[PDB]
Symmetry: D2
C-alpha cells in the first residue's frame, strides 16, 4: 500500500505541472 | 492539450481503481 | 484514513467529469 | 475552463497533502 500511495502521489504531482501548463497555454 | 488531458484522465481513472483497492484492503 | 480515501476518490471522480467536459468543449 | 482547471489543481494539491499524511500514518 505504501509504494502504491507513492505512485499515486507522483501522478498527482505530474498533474499539477500538466494542468498549470494547460492554464498557461490557454 | 487534448492528448494531454486524455493522459491525465487515464491517470485519474487508474487512481480510482488503486484507491478503491486500498479501501478494500484496509 | 478510510473516510479520507473516500473523499479523495469522490474528488477524482469529479475530475473525470470536469476533464472530459473540457475535452468536449476544446 | 481556466477557472475550472484552477479548481482541479487546488484539489490535486489537497490530495498530495492528504496522501502524504496517509503515508506517514501507515
Ligand atoms: Zn488526481
Amino acid at each position: 500500500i505504501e509504494e502504491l500511495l507513492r505512485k499515486i502521489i507522483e501522478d498527482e504531482v505530474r498533474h499539477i505541472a500538466e494542468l498549470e501548463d494547460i492554464e498557461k497555454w490557454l
